[PDB]
Symmetry: C2
């Protein structure tokens, strides 16, 4: 597989909280303070992230804008549920093959998001201020359905029991 060659070359490993493969490749020396964050943070972090068909990356949330950039493969569907209860969907990919896709997608801070692919996709994902486990939340199925009953179907598909 091309997938296996990519995993070997970029030295990726299974992601604890999801279905894909990852590695953190960069973490900035420069540290900054920001309102709403508990303590100092790196200004920027970057990973590789690779996904396959059949396993969604379940709903999750952070305190920073998160920037997705397309490297190789098919399209990636990014689901979003905003604070006011509205839902949207952005397509990450190559517009020369898929006219409504784009090479860059930014998901706004504090939005609940999840993703799925039809083939495989290799992306680079960045966050600023930089990633810290204290700023991260994994979504709970029953709590999400309680808050957003109008989105039961998509929530069921992109969460664990």
């Amino acid at each position: 597989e091309e997938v296996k060659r990519l995993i070997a070359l970029y030295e990726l490993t299974p992601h604890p909280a999801s279905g894909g493969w990852f590695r953190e490749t960069y973490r900035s020396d420069v540290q900054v303070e920001a309102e709403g964050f508990d303590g100092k943070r790196s200004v920027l972090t970057m990973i590789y992230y690779l996904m396959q068909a059949g396993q969604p990356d379940p709903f999750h949330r952070v305190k920073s804008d998160e920037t997705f950039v397309h490297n190789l493969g098919g399209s990636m569907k990014i689901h979003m549920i905003h604070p006011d209860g509205s839902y949207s969907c952005s397509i990450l990919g190559n517009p020369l093959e898929h006219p409504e896709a784009r090479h860059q997608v930014v998901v706004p801070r504090r939005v609940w998001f999840a993703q799925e692919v039809d083939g495989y996709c290799l992306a680079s994902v960045l966050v600023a201020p930089g990633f810290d486990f204290k700023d991260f939340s994994l979504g709970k199925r029953e709590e999400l359905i309680k808050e957003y009953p109008q989105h039961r179907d998509v929530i069921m598909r992109c969460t664990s029991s």
Copy 2:
């Protein structure tokens, strides 16, 4: 051309200080203070940047790490001259086609750098702290040769008279 379709779709325009095509697509709301910068700065900025054969992007320098990410096309050669006078070269591209190329390249703050391609390349380029004209320097041919006489050849090729 595929190049012309890309310019139209992503709405790019000629870059003032170089040979390629660009547009700033993202600029973070969050502002931070950092030692060595004159005043507050955005935490992160992003552009698209597209290059063609025959025109180099001439030597230049900034105060932040700069992160290159490969989207489409052939390989891109990134020349670097470090503060201690040493020279290095990184290849941005797809290792499935070009075994020594990589999809991500980070150039360290305060390094003089330039680039060239053999075909065409579309990349996404990010900087943190975010870009501000007061942090930017365009290299002068005679001043660069005075400081780094051992690198006369490459300097001649990647600067204007």
